[PDB]
Amino acid sequence: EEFDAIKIALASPDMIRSWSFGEVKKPETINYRTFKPERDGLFCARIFGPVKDYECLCGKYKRLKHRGVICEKCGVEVTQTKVRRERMGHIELASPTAHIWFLKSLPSRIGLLLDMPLRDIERVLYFESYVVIEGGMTNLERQQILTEEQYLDALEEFGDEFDAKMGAEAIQALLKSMDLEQECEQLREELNETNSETKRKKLTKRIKLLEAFVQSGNKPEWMILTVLPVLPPDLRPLVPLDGGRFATSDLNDLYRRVINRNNRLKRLLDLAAPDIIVRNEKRMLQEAVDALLDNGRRGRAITGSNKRPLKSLADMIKGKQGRFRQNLLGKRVDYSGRSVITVGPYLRLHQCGLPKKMALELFKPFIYGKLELRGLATTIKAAKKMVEREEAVVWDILDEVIREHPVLLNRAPTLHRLGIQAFEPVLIEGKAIQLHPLVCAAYNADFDGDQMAVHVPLTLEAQLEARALMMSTNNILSPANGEPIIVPSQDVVLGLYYMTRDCVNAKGEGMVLTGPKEAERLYRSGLASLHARVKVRITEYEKDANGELVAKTSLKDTTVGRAILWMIVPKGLPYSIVNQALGKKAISKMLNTCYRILGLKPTVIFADQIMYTGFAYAARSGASVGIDDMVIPEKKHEIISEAEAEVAEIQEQFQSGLVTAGERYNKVIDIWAAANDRVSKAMMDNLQTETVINRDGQEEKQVSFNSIYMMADSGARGSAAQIRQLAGMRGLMAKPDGSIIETPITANFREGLNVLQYFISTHGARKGLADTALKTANSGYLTRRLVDVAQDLVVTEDDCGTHEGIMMTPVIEGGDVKEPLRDRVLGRVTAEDVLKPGTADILVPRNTLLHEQWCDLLEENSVDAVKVRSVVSCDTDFGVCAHCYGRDLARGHIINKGEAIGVIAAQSIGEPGTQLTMSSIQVKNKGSIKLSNVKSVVNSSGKLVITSRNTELKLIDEFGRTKESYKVPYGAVLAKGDGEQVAGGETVANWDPHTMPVITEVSGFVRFTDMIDGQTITRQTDELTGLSSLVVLDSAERTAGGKDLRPALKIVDAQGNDVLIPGTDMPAQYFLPGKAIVQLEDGVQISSGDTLARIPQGLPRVADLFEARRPKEPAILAEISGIVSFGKETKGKRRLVITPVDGSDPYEEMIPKWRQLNVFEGERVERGDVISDGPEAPHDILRLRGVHAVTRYIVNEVQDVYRLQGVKINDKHIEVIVRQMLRKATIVNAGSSDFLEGEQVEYSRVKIANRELEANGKVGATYSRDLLGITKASLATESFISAASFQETTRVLTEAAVAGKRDELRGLKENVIVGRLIPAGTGYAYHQDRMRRRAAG
Amino acid sequence: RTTDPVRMYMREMGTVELLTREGEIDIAKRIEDGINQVQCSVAEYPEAITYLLEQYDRVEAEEARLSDLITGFVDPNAENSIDPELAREKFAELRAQYVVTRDTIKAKGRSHATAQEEILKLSEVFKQFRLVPKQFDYLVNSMRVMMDRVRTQERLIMKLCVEQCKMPKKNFITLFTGNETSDTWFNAAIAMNKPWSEKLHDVSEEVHRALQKLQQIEEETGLTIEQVKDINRRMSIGEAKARRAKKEMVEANLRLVISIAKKYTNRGLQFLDLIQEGNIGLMKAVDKFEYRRGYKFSTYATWWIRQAITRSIADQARTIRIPVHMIETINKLNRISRQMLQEMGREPTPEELAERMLMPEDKIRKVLKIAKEPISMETPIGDDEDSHLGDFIEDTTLELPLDSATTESLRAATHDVLAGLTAREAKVLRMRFGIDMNTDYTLEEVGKQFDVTRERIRQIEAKALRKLRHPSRSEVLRSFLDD
Ligand SMILES: [Mg+2]
Ligand SMILES: [Zn+2]
Ligand SMILES: [Zn+2]
């Protein structure tokens, strides 16, 4: 069985000769009584193989007396009956025909080769016109079409000296004529002549085709076909039912029609007819052929009596009911079952309820072997009927076996890895699996009708895999982010909040105990309040010594509950930690810190006991919701009366006709929103602390004892808006239009809706519901795409010895920190030695793990930037090291190599999203201020104003780490300078949000030069004031006389000389586009910082983001540094006269100046400086920038997207899929291989790592790096089988076939589909054994 | 951008219109002319005439029949139930023109006018005999090949001489067509004193030897050479005539063809298949038609095509072939059902029609069991696209690992039991039934390998039962008793 690799190829004719047993004949099947095959047809036993034991069709030859005899009555043979499925017959052809995939798909492969278009070839091969096989007289030409009548002209003209024909035969002759060599050298040559772009591309295309056929050895004449295989029956069967009424394939008629039409054809070739019918028949032939190959491709599709079209061969390989997705990747399985699911509250972590008969059914051969071992059921039939008796020993044995035999657990959707688990069995008297409740989380499951299913660890390898990997102890932190996933959900947390609580009210205040035990004596004797602060001693511990506990006791005035709750503490911990009412977040950090500090099991056991005590006390705690908990505040009516009077006033205004309707819309909607807010304040203050309870004092209040509020405060259920829904008016309503309604709701659920109000609720209700139904497909589609890219990657290595990657800095901008740079680093490994602001204090030797000792040790330090051996900066051929990744989250340690990184990345990423679609500047506080890469000016007011748009202001703290960062317009007006100290709450910045200022940093007289009324401009003289200038019109409105003359008001000295840009020799006057209208007159002065002019006025988003979708409106960038001016004057678009400092000027491109410009016609930029506005292209960024810019860009982008919904995932998940979007770099020079072609950046980095190495200095070729859209990148891959499995398979088949492709079974998909072990993780070891075996031969 | 060759062929037959009513008779005239002129090609022959009474007395002397052949042979058109008396008349006169023609073809040679017209009379007395089926065609295959042999010798010598010589061809043909018997041309070519012809002159003995087997076939075939050389072309032309002329008629009535076809293009099969078979039935109506009957041609092929269609759909058109007899009786059934419905107002029972159809309920219920068609695995009997019917079937042939364990534990116990047996008999019991072998040994061979005794072996069968059956090892068998 065992084999190394696979290889595609064309089927040569002699290959079917080499596969064949017999040409076929008449198509009939059986005798309407004797339901038995006829011969040389479709179910002929003779050639595919025999049906029964050693019998001919009549029964003449049998018994092995006639061992090898073929029956001379029927020509029927003697053998076993398995070879049916390995053999294939064949059929010879009366004509030749061509294969369709080499025709009809994009680039033709055949006329492509020939430089003859398709429809030409059609018109030949629909048999409607002839065409020159060969210009015998070169008077006519090879590849020359000659109509049925023009052919005649040439015919009676010449006769002999041409070959000019029609049909597959002519094409055979031609392809058989043409050489590969001469064309190939001549193509390579005359490329040199004019390698114009489309031309050169086409040259390359055909050249490749040529040398491909050369080197594969595949032949073009074998494109044409004269023998065709045949399929065996049982893939196309014919089978009965009770009525003697059968069932058949979609296919058998295809062969039936085909063979019959051949029969007709040959029959009519015996007879020397006109070729008209010959044509008609053979067109029916090719019809039947290519419809077999693809029914519903070419013509009106073919149906039976069904009127459903008939399934092609191709269809069976294709879509989801294609093989790959239907029965090769997902599969029915033996030894499994399913169930409704209920809880086991009392259970332990490892345990799972198990309806015993399920295991009974499932653990059959175990106990049968066990009874032959015991011999009570000596034989097996005895075992069956004894099983059937229900002997108690059956169950004794079954408990005996089921011990330590672990099991699997499956809910659907198994969206991420934790949607299935593996527990130990425990049996139960019922048909209802129990489970440990807390893990509804990972399943997102609930006891409302959900279901689950099971699978069996038969092999011990699976047994142990299970027990070590999917034992629940293993996996309790998410691998995506570092939180526990066993958060105690709703009731437990609440009973907890009840206990650990501090009334003043109940009783028993200000006494002393030795420890919590006698408080239990009280409380279980029922003597003290439990949520009641009272003095007592404790004795806690701490491992302050080198992992050695530090014992001591002392007092606390603590609640009785908290005192008791200490009792479970495992011996490391303070009492301060247990000094509050323990928000759900609190419990999270509890379990966190326990695991962080001790290890797993104390936290485990702690957790179980916590669940248990929660059950106990929340059963004790007393809990109900009712109608008197539901309280509405009183001061609500007259607020609504105020609203009524005010809307009546605004009604009177709109009646009067002063105020408009949309104004009024915003007015009314805002004031209703304010009313809702006031009601919210009312109800919250009237509920949360509504409770006045007195202890040894007149009056005092504390947190409420109402059920509803404590449900809200625990985070178990409820929320302030939800309580508003039941109690208050809940906001307002958007109709399905997307509008928002003017009259919100008045009453609540407590009072009772209106007819209309609920009728109105309906709209947005159904809206959100259809969204509930219909956002998920996006997620699954997305998900399988993502993983389809990224399976191939697994850790290669431990250290790649590589060099620095990207820098790490926090994301605090807009407000405060949004990822602590602490948190950014977490588990990562440096790029380099790294020091402290106390300088020259290195702590990594270029790389260490960075654990919370380091994280806090350097949170002390005010360092705020570090670099890391990046995911992408890694350089291993075929994968990576482990260092460049760092730490396993869900473990909590550096990965040991050999595990799939892509899969968990996508499960991290796409799992959550299912839910997740659903002027001036003002300092807040005091601190230093930083503005860099800045050219600005002390304006005429005495403050800084920008001349370099790149600048943005920051609020730096007094230390130096930024508090805020905010953009600032070009030439905006400040009240402050850089690197100063200024009070919080101050509007430093100001600008008209419509102006785009034209500040003059030169100071000087102004004169009306270059510019004339109505010519380049208008002259508008303000009716308002009296002071104006020459008033510049827009692109269109100026009269075209001076629209080819860039208008420029001009600055000069007294002498009329242009005031140079001070310090530079560049003159300083402004070429004015529209809206830059100046306020001063001729002869007047501007100063430094003086405006001459003022210039007035989602989920699929992320789909576009990672797809590398490239927008419609680029905010384009400076291709190269140096000065620039504008280009040709708008034949559709204007252009851009580049002028480098020292390079070459000519590069210009179209500009829509209908979309605003940023730079002006005498203004300089640096390369990579933005020029237009809108969105931009990342492709340009990579084309211009390196890696870190764009990398950082999109990671920040989409992390902000999901962090809107408050969703936390680490970066490397993102960093890694990027490198799979860069599997290719396009070449620059040549000499190694061909000139440019997009080739593996990996293999590029090899050949340069060999060829530019001492092989040469360089023969080879520089390159540029290439992006690929994920869905195309996937396809654009070495392996084809993966590429055959998900999308656009057919063309992939062809493209592999043409070239003699040969896969090598490295990928996950590749080695799964073959039924081999993984080349990674578990079978990593075995596979690398195979690796160094092949190394070892 | 039309993709449907329906349009192609309706358009391109659209080229040709209907040509009738003398073209009917004028293709007929050209073709009967070609026929009678191939028979004039037959009127000419040399010794080749040693043909007619040979292969005709071939069929006479052995009691010439009146089954299929003479339904093929002469049966003249009257512009019958063959008489056994007129046959015996016809087996006497033909022998006379033959024999009186032989010596008169040997009298001075062949160019003789009275003899020539007596051979034209020999044709005339042959020309009462129609141009009738296969043995004629076989008697003509004779000529089809004898011509090709003549041309084979041409090809051979044209190669050998003209491809080699390659300048000298003029004088060769001249002196050769001139002399043709003796080697008087060679030295006539070589009077011009050609040294390379002297070099070849050593091989002249073999050159006229290469002419010997040239002239050998002359005896081996027996030609008047010019005569056959005319006869071949004459009949070739009498063929070509019809081969052209009929195609006109064929292109004519394509619209009758397609029209009649598109009655039984109910959804029975398909357009063009009916159309093709109609072309067939036509072309066979074309081979046979008489204008002489004086009727419109349409009627004729309207029969012929109808036949062809009517049974081609019955042959094909199903995944189940049904022979025609069932088809016919199904037509009986379906028609009579409807009359009985009108008569009844309701569905008649299998018995009522067992009476009226005139056959018994056996065949009724029988045929009723038969007449339905296969129903296509890929149907989604799952109304939603979840289950195409192909899934729910069972695989009822293969195997049970449970029964595998059953039979394996069995055979294990079998041989474990056979271990406790007599050695003299152990061997026997192995080979007697074929245990542990591909074999089947039961008898005399054993008699010679071991002992000729045969029925004391039977007594030892009784022995072994007694050794075993009496509860000694029965208990382990009895667990397989339930099998
Ligand atoms: Mg549910
Ligand atoms: Zn047989
Ligand atoms: Zn690495």
What distance in Å separates the CA atoms of residue A539 and residue A552, rounded to the nearest whole number? Answer: 6
Q: Ligand 1: distance of its center to the CA of A486 in Å?
A: 18
B480 with A277: Cβ contact below 8 A: no
Ligand at minimal distance from the CA of A62 is 2
The packing angle between helices B401-418 and B423-433, to 10°, is 140
Q: Name the amino acid, one letter, at A604.
A: V
- Residues with Cβ within 8 Å of residue B176, at least 6 apart in sequence: B185
Contacts of A246 in chain B (CB under 8 A): 374-375
Q: Ligand 2: distance of its center to the CA of A21 in Å?
A: 19
Contacts of B477 in chain A (CB under 8 A): none
What distance in Å separates the CA atoms of residue A563 and residue A584, rounded to the nearest whole number? Answer: 19
Of A246, A299, A382, the CB nearest to B3: A299
What distance in Å separates the CA atoms of residue A209 and residue B274, rounded to the nearest whole number? Answer: 45
The two tokens of residue A691 are 């409770």
Q: What angle do CA A230, A232, A237 make, to 5 degrees?
A: 120
The two tokens of residue A220 are 């073009």
- Judge whether A56 is annotated as a binding position: yes
What distance in Å separates the CA atoms of residue B184 and residue B130, rounded to the nearest whole number? Answer: 49
Listed residue (B127, B146, B129) closest to B87, CA to CA: B129
The packing angle between helices A275-293 and A252-269, to 10°, is 160
Burial (CB < 10 A; 0-12, 13-18, 19+), residue B109, is: exposed
User: Helix, strand, coil: what percent of chain A each, to 5?
Assistant: 35, 15, 50
What distance in Å separates the CA atoms of residue A260 and residue A256, rounded to the nearest whole number? Answer: 6
Listed residue (A1182, A1027, A1172) closest to A1112, CA to CA: A1172
The two tokens of residue B8 are 């192609």
Contacts of A388 in chain B (CB under 8 A): none
Cα atoms found within 13 Å of the Cα of residue A176, Cβ hemisphere only: 10
Listed residue (A417, A323, A1286) closest to A785, CA to CA: A1286
Check if the beta carbon of residue B251 is closer than 8 Å to that of residue B271.
no
Tokens 């279980």 sit on residue:
A524
DSSP characters over B396-442 = -SS--HHHHHHHHHHHHHHHHHHTTS-HHHHHHHHHHHTTTSS----
Specify which residues A556 forms β-bridges with: A536
- Judge whether A71 is annotated as a binding position: yes
H or E segment to which residue A655 belongs: helix A637-656
What distance in Å separates the CA atoms of residue A829 and residue A847, rounded to the nearest whole number? Answer: 5
Tokens 């008001």 sit on residue:
A1049
A244 with B320: Cβ contact below 8 A: no
A380 with B374: Cβ contact below 8 A: no
Contacts of B250 in chain A (CB under 8 A): 274
A249 with B409: Cβ contact below 8 A: no
Question: What DSSP designation does A340 have?
Answer: E
Q: Is A428 helix (H, G, I), strand (E, B) or coil?
A: strand
A382 with B267: Cβ contact below 8 A: no
Handedness of CA B322, B323, B324, B330 (dihedral sign): negative
Contacts of A64 in chain B (CB under 8 A): 438
A280 with B372: Cβ contact below 8 A: no
Q: What is the resolution of this structure in A?
A: 4.3
Nearest CA in chain B to A82: B398
Check if the beta carbon of residue A492 is closer than 8 Å to that of residue A591.
no
Q: How far is CA B167 from the centre of its chain?
A: 50
Burial A466-478, CB ≥16 within 10 A → b, else e: bbeebbbeebbbb
Check if the beta carbon of residue B341 is closer than 8 Å to that of residue B349.
no
- Judge whether A884 is annotated as a binding position: yes
How would you classify the pairing of strands A1084-1086 and A1004-1007? Answer: antiparallel
Segments in B73-194 forming alpha helices (H) = 84-90, 94-106, 113-126, 135-157, 164-165, 170-179, 186-190
B243 with A272: Cβ contact below 8 A: yes
**For testing contact with chain A, the best of B272, B313, B376 (most A CBs within 10 A):** B376
Check if the beta carbon of residue A1025 is closer than 8 Å to that of residue A960.
no
- Judge whether A446 is annotated as a binding position: yes
Check if the beta carbon of residue A749 is closer than 8 Å to that of residue A690.
no
What distance in Å separates the CA atoms of residue A59 and residue B224, rounded to the nearest whole number? Answer: 59
Listed residue (A668, A615, A618) closest to A643, CA to CA: A668
**For testing contact with chain A, the best of B15, B267, B271, B319 (most A CBs within 10 A):** B319
- Residues with Cβ within 8 Å of residue B264, at least 6 apart in sequence: B274, B309, B313
How many other C-beta atoms are found inside a 10 Å radius of the C-beta of residue A1179?
A: 14
Check if the beta carbon of residue A247 is closer than 8 Å to that of residue B392.
no
Of A245, A249, A277, the CB nearest to B377: A249
Contacts of A274 in chain B (CB under 8 A): 247, 250-251
The residue ranges of DSSP E strands in A142-252, in sequence order, are 144-146, 163-165, 224-229, 238-239, 247-248
Burial A959-976, CB ≥16 within 10 A → b, else e: eebbbbeeebbbbbbbbb
Q: Name the amino acid, one letter, at B450.
A: F
Cis peptide before A37 (omega within 30 of 0): no
How would you classify the pairing of strands A1122-1126 and A1084-1086? Answer: unpaired
The two tokens of residue B205 are 């003995």
Handedness of CA A592, A594, A599, A604 (dihedral sign): negative
Check if the beta carbon of residue A431 is closer than 8 Å to that of residue A918.
no
DSSP characters over B207-240 = HHHHHHHHHHHHHHHT--HHHHHHHHHHHHHHHH
How would you classify the pairing of strands A944-946 and A936-938? Answer: antiparallel
Q: Is A893 helix (H, G, I), strand (E, B) or coil?
A: strand
Q: Ligand 3: distance of its center to the CA of A799 in Å?
A: 6
B376 with A248: Cβ contact below 8 A: yes
Task: List CB-based neighbours of ion ligand 3 within 5 Å.
Answer: A 800, 874, 880-881, 884
Burial A790-802, CB ≥16 within 10 A → b, else e: bbbbbbbbeebeb
A379 with B479: Cβ contact below 8 A: yes
Check if the beta carbon of residue A339 is closer than 8 Å to that of residue A362.
no
Contacts of B376 in chain A (CB under 8 A): 247-250, 304, 306
Tell me how close the Cα of A380 comes to any Cα of chain B, in angstroms. Answer: 7
Q: Ligand 1: distance of its center to the CA of A450 in Å?
A: 5
Q: Give the largest Cα separation in chain B, rounded.
A: 121
The two tokens of residue A9 are 């190829």
Question: What DSSP designation does A1318 have?
Answer: P
A248 with B375: Cβ contact below 8 A: yes
Specify which residues A1007 forms β-bridges with: A1050
What distance in Å separates the CA atoms of residue B343 and residue A553, rounded to the nearest whole number? Answer: 112
B276 with A264: Cβ contact below 8 A: yes
Helices (H) and strands (E) in chain B, counts: 25, 0
Radius of gyration of chain A, Cα coordinates, nearest whole angstrom: 41
Burial (CB < 10 A; 0-12, 13-18, 19+), residue A531, is: buried
Tokens 């025999």 sit on residue:
A50
- Judge whether A874 is annotated as a binding position: yes
Listed residue (A1267, A1260, A1157, A1276) closest to A1217, CA to CA: A1267
Ligand at minimal distance from the CA of A901 is 3
Q: Give the largest Cα separation in chain A, rounded.
A: 129
The packing angle between helices B23-43 and B113-126, to 10°, is 130
H or E segment to which residue A656 belongs: helix A637-656
Of A250, A305, A381, the CB nearest to B479: A381
What distance in Å separates the CA atoms of residue B375 and residue A304, rounded to the nearest whole number? Answer: 10
Q: How far is CA A416 from the centre of its chain?
A: 13
How many other C-beta atoms are found inside a 10 Å radius of the C-beta of residue A1193?
A: 14
